[PDB]
Amino acid sequence: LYFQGNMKYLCLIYFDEAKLAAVPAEELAAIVDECMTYSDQLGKAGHYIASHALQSVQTATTLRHQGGRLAMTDGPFAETKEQLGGFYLIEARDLNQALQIAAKIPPGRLGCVEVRPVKEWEGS
Template sequence: MKYLGLAYFTPEKFAALRPDEIEALVSQCPARDEQMRATGKVMMAASLGDLDGWKTLRPRNGRTQVSDGPYTEAKEVVGGLFIIDADSPEEAVRIASLHPAATLGEEGGWAVELIPMEFHVGG
């Protein structure tokens, strides 16, 4: 079964951290990411770009409306994502637990949402 992991953060909490706190936190991420990839079960992982470059598209009056930034009513924002190919829900949780957002950064409002999914490859 495939699982989508969404790594969240809370921009206001993250912005309240001092630069040295951010550096101490972020410097731990590569090792945690590598632990997760070393399981051999991670199909892909990505960090998402700066919020200033985001666009939101919505249907409005038969046309597509484009606005800057992420969905504005959200308190948490997706900062990264990954896909795991796990043999069981328990294995998926164990692997997702290795992600930095699941183990570090409580003060930055980090979290991981793990979602079972059907995976379709176009053709």
């Protein structure tokens, strides 16, 4: 007998925010539409778990535990070339299938998509 499935993967959508100005507003809207349509197809296929587009890192607030002290700072965890702009939490039969799905995430064309397996293996 084998443990019964449910391999989940976090598909991280990374892209330079400073380049959304260069992208025509109408095409940017298309990505949003294709994204809703893709999520629906994923849902019907049984892959969809959750997904969200994130607001600018400018809206972020970071909390860091230093000594035993908590410090609050404006902005993201760190300055990076590409910021985390959204994610898709899915379940697939394996990493290869997860990559096939991630390759189709619409917003991913704005930069890249990092596929990371989660630790939790739900099943029996």
